[PDB]
Write a protein that binds this DNA or RNA. Structure first.
Ligand SMILES: [K+]
Ligand SMILES: [K+]
Ligand SMILES: [K+]
Ligand SMILES: [Mg+2]
Ligand SMILES: [Mg+2]
Ligand SMILES: [Mg+2]
Ligand SMILES: [Mg+2]
Ligand SMILES: [Mg+2]
Ligand SMILES: [Mg+2]
Ligand SMILES: [Mg+2]
Ligand SMILES: [Mg+2]
Ligand SMILES: [Mg+2]
Ligand SMILES: [Zn+2]
Lengths: 132, 51, 63, 343, 225
RNA sequence: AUAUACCGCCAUCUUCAGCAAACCCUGAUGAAGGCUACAAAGUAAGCGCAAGUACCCACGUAAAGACGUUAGGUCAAGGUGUAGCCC
């Protein structure tokens, strides 16, 4: 039986998001990609470097906004701009979200030597696609 | 036991409301000690106070 | 909380009793009608048995 | 390496090993399982080992109307914070370790006799707060399946009652024990019997019946006699509201047959009013405590017969040798008439 | 203050009369005899619990005592009328496919309900799941045929007793009346018998509904003035 | 060291069509069982199949393929419980 990226059926009490509820074979069919860049296009370079950066940014944001992320990050690159789009919860005070946005944008801009912007969308609770 | 666990319960011939709790209301017999769980020491004091 | 023990008494007795015990807060709509105009036989479950030995049905031939 | 690190959910799912061939068929004799602890519970965003005070994250942004600047706690001031966090963490663990003492049933490890509380409120705002639930038997039953082999299920017997004559019982089945409790107790309220009680404390007459192979002999008793019956009969009688009765169980002692037999006998008893109506005579009670005073307990609602009930010089009633042997002082048992706790 | 007078003048007043709706004028032993209600099944099909209602066997064919049918029918029609007066939900049930169309139309015409189709497990005992937690079940079930198409009692007879719903039922000589609240011994097969039953219940139900409106309307007009 | 503590990713039946929460009913309220369409106690969310999508069509091929079965494979992808080593 295939296991990769499959949330398995339970008793009907497990809420899954739209991203989580779709196995890999639905990628490009029912669900899109969580990062968009040109490195994996034919004739394009630096796919290895874009991949390492993506893995770090996901770990960095998970631990920088602990317990606040309500879904996977969407990473967008245009030119040298890096846009991080995150769906977050509404538990942290707004002052703390502004601190972490200013802190994270600056720290990541100096780390990866590119203009980095963070776009936060807040939701009252994790959006549930179905109960598996 | 019920008597020894509460030091404010005093087995005395004047505390008739406590003594009534160890006598059957329908037959007037004094319960044997296993009925209520009182130790032998307090059951004797209850039987003497009741009498 | 009507009882579903249909083989224990009748719907009237089971309803009448649970009303007395306070289990049923209100009497059902039919209870007062049954009480005023009851059936000839109270509808109590009975198990039908086959006859044995010398037992015969009491139905007579019409001549 | 930073890139080899995983999330807490990944780490706990592995370490706990809740899913695995060992969990499948209880293949291992295991008792104390590791329990996942939430390591982010008491953690504050912005707090670190170095004791830095980040304005707007872990300390207030503005102080005295002016914006605070980056600051760092002193070594001593940071020791207190660390110690205070450890004490708070130990307190959290301490409380979790502390557990409430369960009131036991018929025995310390048995489920029988334990209360399950009132049945759950029905969908249409229906409530059963007046009803109490008692467990009578919890059995682990096993069936053999093609794939999974020996599969484990729970069979529960529960009794419900309000203490005022309305009581019932139901079986519950489920893989989990708490689900079996829910099914049995919620179903039992839909199968309630009404039990007639003499003076709201005892049965109307001696009841002797057999249900399958279980024999139950019950005797009407006066006030103060208590419940001197099989422990399960005691439990059921408290739910019905019977205070004084003697019962003896003979033959197969099966909890489900005992419960079903008990409820059959108690539902099928003739009251004094029914006896008077059936025979159109007065039912007169004679009490030795009241001497020769005749106490009419029930009178027929319809006409009253004029012809005395025939007086058969000798009744052709079947007697129980145990009852006769006791009345003649020939019954010797070290276990009979023993001193017991109030029931 | 005004509710006790309402329930007393409207709900309790009909219950003080032996025949408040005059349902005895709807039928006679002769009208039943012409509809062949006395005709039962052959003796070999006789159900033991129907012997008290059987006049006898005419050449191995059981004859139903119409004197008893007349008394039982009075009680059943009287009960049915009182339940229609109280605005109860009346459900007609029968699996005899020869009369499914007739019974469904009679139910619609009287403003009541019919179930003549295959009866699915739990329509009554599991109604909240099938229909919804707020579903109202019938206050009276009328069986024009108490047997299913394999000649066993209709499952709704047992389940009606489980749900404490009173049942009126035409019971032929091969039927089991133990759990039917108001049984009516009578022929359930002949089209003339079945048509008669439908007219009597339809008329009893329709009359009781009209009587309820007359009483209410009068009680309101007098209330204002 | 332990795949006989596990996550992760998989083989296998599967070139299968079943699994099943929550109820209901039958068996005297036993383990258990629940269908007949001219129908007789089952209703079943969800999951799988199916449907859709990819490739050159609606075909075919891919992909998909639940719950479980073999304490199946892998502590030597990486991570990790327990135990062990630290001149
Ligand atoms: K494995
Ligand atoms: K490994
Ligand atoms: K290891
Ligand atoms: Mg494969
Ligand atoms: Mg061991
Ligand atoms: Mg112990
Ligand atoms: Mg017929
Ligand atoms: Mg293995
Ligand atoms: Mg393939
Ligand atoms: Mg498919
Ligand atoms: Mg192995
Ligand atoms: Mg092998
Ligand atoms: Zn003591």
């Amino acid at each position: 039986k295939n296991r990769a990226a499959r949330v398995r059926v339970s008793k009907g009490d497990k809420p899954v998001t739209y991203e989580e509820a779709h196995a890999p074979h639905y990628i490009a069919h029912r669900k899109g990609w969580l990062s968009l860049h040109t490195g994996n296009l034919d004739g394009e370079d630096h796919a290895a470097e874009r991949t390492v950066e993506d893995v770090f940014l996901r770990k960095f944001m998970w631990g920088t906004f602990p317990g606040c992320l309500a879904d996977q990050l969407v990473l967008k690159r245009r030119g040298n701009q890096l846009e991080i789009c995150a769906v977050v919860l509404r538990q942290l005070s707004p002052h703390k979200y502004y601190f972490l946005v200013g802190y994270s944008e600056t720290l990541l801009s100096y780390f990866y030597k590119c203009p980095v912007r963070l776009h936060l969308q807040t939701v009252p609770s994790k959006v549930v696609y179905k109960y598996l | 036991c019920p008597i020894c666990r509460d030091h404010k319960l005093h087995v005395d011939f004047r505390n008739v409301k406590l003594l009534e709790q160890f006598v059957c209301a329908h037959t007037g017999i004094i319960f044997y000690a296993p009925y209520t769980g009182v130790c032998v020491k307090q059951h004797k004091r209850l039987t003497q106070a009741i009498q | 909380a009507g009882s579903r023990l249909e083989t224990v008494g009748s719907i009237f007795s089971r309803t009448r009793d649970l009303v007395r015990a306070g289990v049923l807060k209100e009497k059902p709509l039919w209870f007062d009608v049954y009480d005023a105009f009851p059936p000839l036989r109270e509808p109590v479950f009975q198990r039908p048995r086959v006859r044995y030995g010398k037992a015969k049905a009491p139905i007579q031939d019409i001549w | 390496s930073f890139f080899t690190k995983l999330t807490a959910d990944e780490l706990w799912k592995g370490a706990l090993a809740e899913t695995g061939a060992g969990a499948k068929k209880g293949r291992g004799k295991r008792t104390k399982k590791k329990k996942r602890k939430d390591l982010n519970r008491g953690q504050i965003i912005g707090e670190g080992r170095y004791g830095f005070l980040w304005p707007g994250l872990n300390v207030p942004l503005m102080k005295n109307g002016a914006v605070q600047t980056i600051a760092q706690r002193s070594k001593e001031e940071q020791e207190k914070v660390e110690a205070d966090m450890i004490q708070q963490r130990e307190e959290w663990d301490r409380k979790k370790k502390m557990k409430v003492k369960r009131e036991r049933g018929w025995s310390g490890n048995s489920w029988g006799g334990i209360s399950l509380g009132p049945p759950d409120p029905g969908p249409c705002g229906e409530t059963y707060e007046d009803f109490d639930t008692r467990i009578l038997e919890v059995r682990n039953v096993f069936t053999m399946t093609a794939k999974e082999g020996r599969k484990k299920s729970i069979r529960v017997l529960v009794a419900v009652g309000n203490g005022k004559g309305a009581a019932g019982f139901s079986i519950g089945k489920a893989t989990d024990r708490m689900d079996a409790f829910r099914k049995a107790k919620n179903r039992a309220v839909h199968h309630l019997h009404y039990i007639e009680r003499y003076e709201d404390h005892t049965i109307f007459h001696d009841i002797s019946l057999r249900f399958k192979r279980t024999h139950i002999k019950m005797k009407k008793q006066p006030k103060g006699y208590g419940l001197r019956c099989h422990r399960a009969i005691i439990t059921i009688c408290r739910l019905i509201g019977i205070k004084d009765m003697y019962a003896k169980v003979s033959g197969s002692i099966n909890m489900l047959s005992l419960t079903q037999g008990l409820f059959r006998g108690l539902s099928r008893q003739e009251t004094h009013q029914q006896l008077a109506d059936k025979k159109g005579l007065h039912v007169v009670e004679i009490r030795e405590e009241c001497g020769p005073l005749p106490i009419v307990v029930a009178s027929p609602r319809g006409p009253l017969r004029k012809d005395p009930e025939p007086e058969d010089e000798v009744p052709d009633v079947k007697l129980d040798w145990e009852d006769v042997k006791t009345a003649q002082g020939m019954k010797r048992s070290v276990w009979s008439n023993l001193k017991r706790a109030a029931t | 203050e005004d509710s006790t007078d309402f329930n007393d003048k409207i709900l309790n007043e009909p219950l003080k009369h032996s025949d408040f709706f005059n349902v005895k004028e709807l039928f006679s032993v002769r009208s039943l005899f012409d509809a062949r209600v006395h005709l039962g099944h052959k003796a070999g099909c006789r159900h033991r619990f129907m012997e008290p209602y059987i006049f006898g066997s005419r050449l191995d064919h059981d004859i139903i005592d119409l004197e008893q049918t007349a008394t039982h029918l009075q009680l059943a029609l009287n009960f049915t009328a009182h339940m229609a007066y109280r605005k109860g939900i009346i459900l007609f049930i029968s699996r005899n496919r020869q009369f499914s169309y007739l019974i469904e139309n009679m139910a619609r015409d009287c403003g009541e309900y019919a179930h003549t189709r295959y009866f699915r497990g739990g329509m009554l005992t599991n109604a909240r799941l099938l229909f919804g937690p707020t579903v109202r079940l019938p206050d009276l079930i009328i069986f024009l045929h108490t047997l299913n198409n394999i000649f066993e009692p209709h499952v709704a007879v047992r389940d009606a007793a489980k749900m404490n719903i009173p049942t009126v039922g035409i019971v032929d000589t091969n039927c089991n009346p133990c759990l039917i609240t108001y049984p009516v011994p009578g022929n359930d097969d002949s089209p003339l018998a079945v048509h008669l039953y439908c007219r009597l219940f339809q008329t009893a139900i329709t009359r009781a509904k009209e009587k309820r409106q007359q009483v209410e309307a009068l009680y309101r007009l007098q209330g204002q003035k």
